[PDB]
UniProtKB/Swiss-Prot annotation, chain A:
Troponin I is the inhibitory subunit of troponin, the thin filament regulatory complex which confers calcium-sensitivity to striated muscle actomyosin ATPase activity. It comes from Mus musculus (Mouse). Interacts with TRIM63. Binds to actin and tropomyosin. Interacts with STK4/MST1. The gene is Tnni3. It comes from the Eukaryota. Phosphorylation by STK4/MST1 alters its binding affinity to TNNC1 (cardiac Tn-C) and TNNT2 (cardiac Tn-T). This is Troponin I, cardiac muscle. The modification Phosphoserine is found at S8, S41. Belongs to the troponin I family.
Swiss-Prot record, chain B:
Actins are highly conserved proteins that are involved in various types of cell motility and are ubiquitously expressed in all eukaryotic cells. The modification N6-methyllysine is found at K80. Belongs to the actin family. The modification Methionine (R)-sulfoxide is found at M40, M43. Transmembrane segments: none annotated. In vertebrates 3 main groups of actin isoforms, alpha, beta and gamma have been identified. The alpha actins are found in muscle tissues and are a major constituent of the contractile apparatus. The beta and gamma actins coexist in most cell types as components of the cytoskeleton and as mediators of internal cell motility. This is Actin, alpha cardiac muscle 1. Polymerization of globular actin (G-actin) leads to a structural filament (F-actin) in the form of a two-stranded helix. Each actin can bind to 4 others. It is found in: Cytoplasm, Cytoskeleton. The modification Tele-methylhistidine is found at H69. Oxidation of Met-40 and Met-43 by MICALs (MICAL1, MICAL2 or MICAL3) to form methionine sulfoxide promotes actin filament depolymerization. MICAL1 and MICAL2 produce the (R)-S-oxide form. The (R)-S-oxide form is reverted by MSRB1 and MSRB2, which promotes actin repolymerization. Monomethylation at Lys-80 (K86me1) regulates actin-myosin interaction and actomyosin-dependent processes. Demethylation by ALKBH4 is required for maintaining actomyosin dynamics supporting normal cleavage furrow ingression during cytokinesis and cell migration.
Amino acid sequence: LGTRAKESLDLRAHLKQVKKEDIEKENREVGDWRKNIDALSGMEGRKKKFEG
Amino acid sequence: TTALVCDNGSGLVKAGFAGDDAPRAVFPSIVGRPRHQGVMVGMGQKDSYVGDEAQSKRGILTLKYPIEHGIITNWDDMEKIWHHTFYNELRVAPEEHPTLLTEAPLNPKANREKMTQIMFETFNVPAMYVAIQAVLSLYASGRTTGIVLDSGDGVTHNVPIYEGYALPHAIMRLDLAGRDLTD
Ligand SMILES: Nc1ncnc2c1ncn2[C@@H]1O[C@H](COP(=O)(O)OP(=O)(O)O)[C@@H](O)[C@H]1O
Ligand SMILES: [Mg+2]
């Protein structure tokens, strides 16, 4: 009984390792970028050129 | 060289060199022959006063607009108006200047073809281009989308534009304009 139980335990151990430890390879992607504001400072242009 | 941005319109001809803020010369587009007899000799009476001159002698003239609803109905008078615009209100010979006329949407083809034929044969310009009157009004607003309602004096047309791609199936041209309101 112990042998059969430990067989399944060891079999699932490696699967759990691969599933979980490999998550630590990267988890910062949740972090978003700046997305800064202007605060009425980027108003320094007239209606001179618009195509470029 | 510089380009001539003429804009025939219907009711006021607006013209001027490209790159400025306002048209150089704005004057009504009417050509009026005198109708009475005339007794003073040597007064120097001409046979047709065009432009803003016929808005001062209008007491003895019969003013008649050469453009009815966008389309041009009297080609000789329109040629006279263009000749006046080039030579007396701007004083630049057309042999050395590109021209950019404007035309309402959904107008007859023959009108546009005759316009280009006149500009190339009579005035002999180097190069001319015809543009739809609503896209320009969208340029001036500094936008690139939007639906523009250009209620002129001849014809009211409503051209929708998105991201620079005009929608040709959604142009609604209606012939009520300032002239009908005057009447
Ligand atoms: N300040 C104003 N108030 C009301 N109506 C005006 C005014 N100025 C012009 N209009 C009307 O608009 C007409 C001029 O329209 P305009 O834009 O010159 O036509 P076009 O597209 O042919 O140039 C005039 O006939 C007049 O009836
Ligand atoms: Mg107009």
